[PDB]
Design an enzyme around this catalytic site. Structure first.
Site, PDB file in Angstrom:
ATOM      1  N   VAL A 191       1.075  53.973 -16.916  1.00  8.09           N
ATOM      2  CA  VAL A 191       2.507  54.219 -17.217  1.00  8.09           C
ATOM      3  C   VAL A 191       3.415  52.910 -17.014  1.00  8.09           C
ATOM      4  CG1 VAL A 191       1.797  56.182 -15.478  1.00  8.09           C
ATOM      5  CG2 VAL A 191       3.978  54.462 -14.764  1.00  8.09           C
TER       6      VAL A 191
ATOM      7  N   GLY B  62       3.134  46.081  -7.866  1.00  8.31           N
ATOM      8  CA  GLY B  62       1.723  46.964  -8.177  1.00  8.31           C
ATOM      9  C   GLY B  62       1.938  47.550  -9.616  1.00  8.31           C
ATOM     10  N   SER B  63       0.574  47.883 -10.048  1.00  7.47           N
ATOM     11  CA  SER B  63       0.280  48.929 -11.469  1.00  7.47           C
ATOM     12  C   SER B  63       0.370  50.421 -11.120  1.00  7.47           C
ATOM     13  CB  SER B  63      -0.749  48.143 -11.986  1.00  7.47           C
ATOM     14  OG  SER B  63      -0.750  46.738 -11.883  1.00  7.47           O
ATOM     15  N   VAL B  64       0.659  50.957 -12.149  1.00  8.64           N
ATOM     16  CA  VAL B  64       0.724  52.385 -12.059  1.00  8.64           C
ATOM     17  C   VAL B  64      -0.071  53.183 -13.077  1.00  8.64           C
ATOM     18  CG1 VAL B  64       2.199  54.477 -11.873  1.00  8.64           C
ATOM     19  CG2 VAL B  64       3.173  52.318 -10.809  1.00  8.64           C
TER      20      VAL B  64
ATOM     21  N   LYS C 264      -0.729  54.338  -7.728  1.00  5.31           N
ATOM     22  CA  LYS C 264      -0.322  52.818  -7.539  1.00  5.31           C
ATOM     23  C   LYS C 264      -1.542  51.895  -7.042  1.00  5.31           C
ATOM     24  CE  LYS C 264       4.204  50.488  -6.164  1.00  5.31           C
ATOM     25  NZ  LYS C 264       4.269  49.391  -5.289  1.00  5.31           N
TER      26      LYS C 264
ATOM     27  N   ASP D 198      10.693  54.140  -4.059  1.00  2.83           N
ATOM     28  CA  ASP D 198      10.974  52.911  -3.984  1.00  2.83           C
ATOM     29  C   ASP D 198      11.997  51.939  -3.046  1.00  2.83           C
ATOM     30  OD1 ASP D 198       8.630  52.736  -5.620  1.00  2.83           O
ATOM     31  OD2 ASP D 198       9.582  51.470  -7.218  1.00  2.83           O
TER      32      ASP D 198
HETATM   33  O1  LIG Z   1       6.705  60.719 -12.105  1.00  3.92           O
HETATM   34  C1  LIG Z   1       6.438  59.692 -11.435  1.00  3.92           C
HETATM   35  N1  LIG Z   1       5.733  60.107 -10.362  1.00  3.92           N
HETATM   36  C2  LIG Z   1       5.777  59.141  -9.434  1.00  3.92           C
HETATM   37  N2  LIG Z   1       5.525  57.900 -10.020  1.00  3.92           N
HETATM   38  N3  LIG Z   1       5.271  56.676  -8.866  1.00  3.92           N
HETATM   39  C3  LIG Z   1       5.353  55.467  -9.187  1.00  3.92           C
HETATM   40  S1  LIG Z   1       4.810  54.192  -8.026  1.00  3.92           S
HETATM   41  C4  LIG Z   1       4.024  55.297  -6.849  1.00  3.92           C
HETATM   42  C5  LIG Z   1       4.356  55.180  -5.509  1.00  3.92           C
HETATM   43  C6  LIG Z   1       4.001  55.941  -4.601  1.00  3.92           C
HETATM   44  C7  LIG Z   1       2.801  56.469  -4.869  1.00  3.92           C
HETATM   45  F1  LIG Z   1       1.763  57.112  -3.771  1.00  3.92           F
HETATM   46  C8  LIG Z   1       2.036  56.460  -5.922  1.00  3.92           C
HETATM   47  C9  LIG Z   1       2.814  55.684  -7.051  1.00  3.92           C
HETATM   48  F2  LIG Z   1       2.444  55.769  -8.252  1.00  3.92           F
HETATM   49  C10 LIG Z   1       5.672  55.130 -10.646  1.00  3.92           C
HETATM   50  C11 LIG Z   1       6.394  56.241 -11.466  1.00  3.92           C
HETATM   51  C12 LIG Z   1       6.239  57.186 -11.107  1.00  3.92           C
HETATM   52  C13 LIG Z   1       6.464  58.363 -12.010  1.00  3.92           C
HETATM   53  C14 LIG Z   1       6.965  57.989 -13.262  1.00  3.92           C
HETATM   54  C15 LIG Z   1       6.231  58.444 -14.493  1.00  3.92           C
HETATM   55 CL1  LIG Z   1       4.371  58.879 -14.342  1.00  3.92          CL
HETATM   56  C16 LIG Z   1       6.632  57.820 -15.657  1.00  3.92           C
HETATM   57  C17 LIG Z   1       7.877  57.623 -15.724  1.00  3.92           C
HETATM   58  C18 LIG Z   1       8.669  57.380 -14.690  1.00  3.92           C
HETATM   59  C19 LIG Z   1       8.456  57.654 -13.643  1.00  3.92           C
HETATM   60 CL2  LIG Z   1       9.461  57.490 -12.330  1.00  3.92          CL
END
Ligand SMILES: O=c1ncn2nc(Sc3ccc(F)cc3F)ccc2c1-c1c(Cl)cccc1Cl
Ligand SMILES: Fc1ccc(-c2c[nH]nc2-c2ccnc(F)c2)cc1
Ligand SMILES: Fc1ccc(-c2c[nH]nc2-c2ccnc(F)c2)cc1
Length: 330
Positions: A25, A26-28, A43, A158
């Site tokens: 989508v 640290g790295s995600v 993450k 965040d």
């Molecule tokens: O829907 C989401 N749900 C969670 N995150 N978390 C994260 S970071 C994160 C934090 C804590 C975790 F346990 C795990 C992590 F990955 C980044 C994006 C995200 C989205 C998301 C997506 Cl998948 C696409 C576009 C925009 C966003 Cl805001």
């Protein structure tokens, strides 16, 4: 568990077999959680123990996520490391419920009705009441830190485009004793943008940001001036051309007057006078959503580590304990 390894955009992912279909989508990454049947966001913390600050920051993010158990706040489904011992330990992976987009993804190209704005901001404040009750200031509330699924359900991410635009003028002034209403400021700015479809304060730097903030909310009155300790901040502010607080009905013309009334309670210049998350949740704009019996508060959060000056190996060990002691939400 059993792990598998792959490369996604130069980064290397080592996660349990339960997590399938890793998609950047640290790295995600987005993944599929085969145990629960739900889609998750995973993450990878980059260089978690690169330095003391990184190590304390790694520990901080993990302690925060472990504590947050609220519908409108990001919490932990799982925490894991492929490391099989403390000495091998050099990677932290955090997983949470995937929502699928952020608020900036929604706003853009899009007009939201007043009922959608009610639902969305209600949720942010409901999440903030919970966070603020744990003695946590988010400090960087903005659209991209608000995760929103297709039901328009919202989670704040965040705590610990441009960040600048949603930021409280006292943070722009560099006051080190700002309070939790710094977050209320941001929410006021976020709300304004959903009602209007434009950034309320699109500043080019810290100075321009403050300048356009004062155009709407006015230059400080006497009460506020008395609280500014810094002679140079005061010289500057008071050397600008004095500016009245604009009428919010004029500026946000055509908006639900109940939404305009909340707006001006959130965007009061003096932070001492700004509405709290709990007070805001009782405001009449959210009569449709509000339930005092369903706006819970957080258990006590131990932030005493914040003050402490430790070795990298000490933050690492502490983080290791927190990974191991994790018990999932079930
Ligand atoms: O829907 C989401 N749900 C969670 N995150 N978390 C994260 S970071 C994160 C934090 C804590 C975790 F346990 C795990 C992590 F990955 C980044 C994006 C995200 C989205 C998301 C997506 Cl998948 C696409 C576009 C925009 C966003 Cl805001
Ligand atoms: F109940 C189940 C069992 C397995 C799956 C599944 C689907 N695709 N891949 C898997 C998988 C692969 C490797 N290890 C696992 F645990 C799961 C989904 C639900
Ligand atoms: F131009 C200005 C002047 C003051 C503020 C301000 C808003 N809330 N609190 C403050 C504040 C309080 C104490 N010391 C400070 F430095 C700032 C913001 C912009």
């Amino acid at each position: 568990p059993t792990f598998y390894r792959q490369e996604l955009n130069k980064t290397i992912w080592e996660v349990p077999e339960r997590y399938q279909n890793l998609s950047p989508v640290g790295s995600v990454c987005a993944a599929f959680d085969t145990k629960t049947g739900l889609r998750v966001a995973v993450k990878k913390l980059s260089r978690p123990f690169q330095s003391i600050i990184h190590a304390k920051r790694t520990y901080r993010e993990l302690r925060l996520l472990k504590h947050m158990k609220h519908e409108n706040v990001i919490g932990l489904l799982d925490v894991f490391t492929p490391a099989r011992s403390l000495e091998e330990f050099n990677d932290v992976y955090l997983v949470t419920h995937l929502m699928g987009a952020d608020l900036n993804n929604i706003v853009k190209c899009q007009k939201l009705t007043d009922d959608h704005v009610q639902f969305l901001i209600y949720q942010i404040l409901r999440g903030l009441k919970y966070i603020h009750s744990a003695d946590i200031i988010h400090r960087d509330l903005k659209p991209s830190n608000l995760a929103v699924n297709e039901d328009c359900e919202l989670k704040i991410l965040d705590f610990g485009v441009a960040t600048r635009w949603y930021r409280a003028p006292e943070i722009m002034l560099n006051w080190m004793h700002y309070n939790q209403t710094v977050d209320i400021w941001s929410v006021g700015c976020i709300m304004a943008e959903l009602l209007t479809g434009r950034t309320l304060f699109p500043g080019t730097d810290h100075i321009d940001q403050l300048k356009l903030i004062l155009r709407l909310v006015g230059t400080p009155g006497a009460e506020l001036l008395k609280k500014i300790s810094s002679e140079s901040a005061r010289n500057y502010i008071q050397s600008l051309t004095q500016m009245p607080k604009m009428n919010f009905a004029n500026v946000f013309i055509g908006a639900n007057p109940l939404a305009v009334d909340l707006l001006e309670k959130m965007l009061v210049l003096d932070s001492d006078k700004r509405i709290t998350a709990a007070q805001a949740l009782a405001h009449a704009y959210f009569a449709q959503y509000h339930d005092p019996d369903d706006e819970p508060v957080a258990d006590p959060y131990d932030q005493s580590f914040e003050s402490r000056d430790l070795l990298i190996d000490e933050w690492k060990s502490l983080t290791y304990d927190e990974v191991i002691s994790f018990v999932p939400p079930p």
